[PDB]
Amino acid sequence: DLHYLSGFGNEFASEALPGALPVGQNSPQKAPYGLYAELLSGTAFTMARSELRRTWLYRIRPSALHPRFERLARQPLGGPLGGINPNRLRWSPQPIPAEPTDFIEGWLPMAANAGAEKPAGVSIYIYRANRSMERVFFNADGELLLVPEQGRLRIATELGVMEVEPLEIAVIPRGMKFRVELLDGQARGYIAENHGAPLRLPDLGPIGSNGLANPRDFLTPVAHYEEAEGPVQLVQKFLGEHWACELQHSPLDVVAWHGSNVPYKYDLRRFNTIGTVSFDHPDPSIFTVLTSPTSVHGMANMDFVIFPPRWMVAENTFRPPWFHRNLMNEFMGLINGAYDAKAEGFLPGGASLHGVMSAHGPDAETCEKAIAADLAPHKIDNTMAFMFETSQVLRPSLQALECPQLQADYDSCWATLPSTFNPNRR
Template structure:
């Protein structure tokens, strides 16, 4: 007897969200640049109207913009939030004392605390706060290392490091009005509560919190160290794929945005610290800023696991440009483009080529850091939690011994960057270093000596073929 089974009309029980894990208890919506909709209470989002006369649950509607109203539809960024109390319910702002001496937002010659230099530099792992420094949270542990442009003009970027030994709070939030901020934890997870919901980021993941969004950082592992890249006047985007095709590199479906989650706190005093033009200003309010019951839009925080990056190996011969390693890119005004490149495990199978990074003088400035693993470049010393700086148009590359090894090796398939994540911020402009980085960080490496000093070029052994006097074999 034959049994025929039919099944029609199967429907998903709800939209897809990621499942929680032991390391991350939160769920996320997936996609990059989506227009999401999320509600923590059923019916909290209005239908067909952003500002009804009276919102469900007597919530307050509030719009947050990341682009001008007249921006083209493709670049329009905004979200609508439905919250318990409006954001404007706060006391007048006041300067935060003492001032944040190690945060900078202007990197022109007008700022004596930021210096453009043609010298390459390296920093060992930036230190965690000592016991004598007391409790240092994310905001207090934020230090500017380098940057370009001016936050007040909405053009440029800054690279900070953070080192903290305490969570923010319990009733303290931060809001960066200077630009979007990309956080890369290197040691310790970041439990980030935002107005849009919660994110957990471990070393190997990045988090982006856009300008104007209030958030708080807790340290579930007791300490936190990492990098914070900030862009002024622009936003992080996915790079074009070009001949790579429809797939590869950082895939949009691997970016994760929080679902709505809210607290009710109408009896406690909260402090919100705002960064504006590199200065810290604070204001008090008698309610939590994390009271958004529902929201919709495409201006929202997100995270991404760098291990998911789909690496492209180099070609059959010769090298591909490092742009194949680009995760996100940002336009920072006046044609300045900055890319986040990530170096993750991949296999090389090129023939008859120089496999290490070739010698180059690049119009871009290179700021390189490391999350975990071992870096094998000989022209620089880099460890997890450290940083290197290669200035625009200045030559850099490998040592003479590395050159000898690379030009005489038997080439075969080779696995590189195993158990390693390193990154580079590629900036198509000059970058200035701060006085903190050069004088107060405590981890600046001595300037590296000339790695090719006293090396006689191998070319001189061929002078006999040109009618000259050949040099003796070494």
């Protein structure tokens, strides 16, 4: 099977041929095997070492060997920004379109902080694919966080091949070349496109030096190169547009590499979930897998949080999520099973958006159940929900608002919430 290197943020080193990596230097005059040294600077040169993301590649042909890029006619992301809407929104799962749509062609824009033409913050999509990619792609607009829901993915990147299935997540750095093979014929899932500071592990605070997503579970592929003599289309996403050129070699021609700006996968089943071992309901930030910070300490660009199988032990407490109003913007998804807060309507591939200060919380069915529950240890199982929480307002696209999937009467799930107040009895 495919091999991997472990350790989030490590200075990795990988060669497909022995001695392909130069020893004791980055730029020899005549590189082993007659390879070309190339530097991929994922961060500004002057970043603190802790923030540094850079990889040295030793390849057959320089990435510079390409003709002029031309705008393609076929622009999945060229749709308008939907009109202003403060309502709580919920979508049913997205159907796979009948027309041939590969991985890059199938990104349906759901909600974003800014227009595709001026990338800032986070852009959220749902991908629907029915074709494997017969081209190579790189995103100039940001880091890609992939959340499969339906079907396995075999992702051929410049640094190696990774296999990603639902219940796992994968990250592609900005500008890195990749090609998506659909192993099950069709694929559906979620994407967080990070335009900001790279995703990293959260500051654990009192949790200390261990817990949540343990760095040892972040897997990076080993060196792997191709040698195809012939035309291969290279596509790039630039300011929301797809631009392409034809190469006469495969751009996945990296024989060896070393550095820290790498693609990676992580299995969510390995999450060391922390929670209440006493009473009350911890803030959902406790379930943080990865985070993208801003220059405002403590206020993330986005937080990727999961709602995984876990033990529920809170005594004399209302166990489902509390009623909530938040400065932050809450985009919810579902990979497997059902979510603890919504009795009906939220299915795998579905989505919910509770924007800035929009009043949310449990439905009446969940409320009645929880207040009547005989509280004893209970293990939540066979489920995996997640949230992409952003600091900037998420603006739904015109496409997601005109979407047949956008539920018509979502507000009705809270309509049957009764008054239980009696001032004459504490």
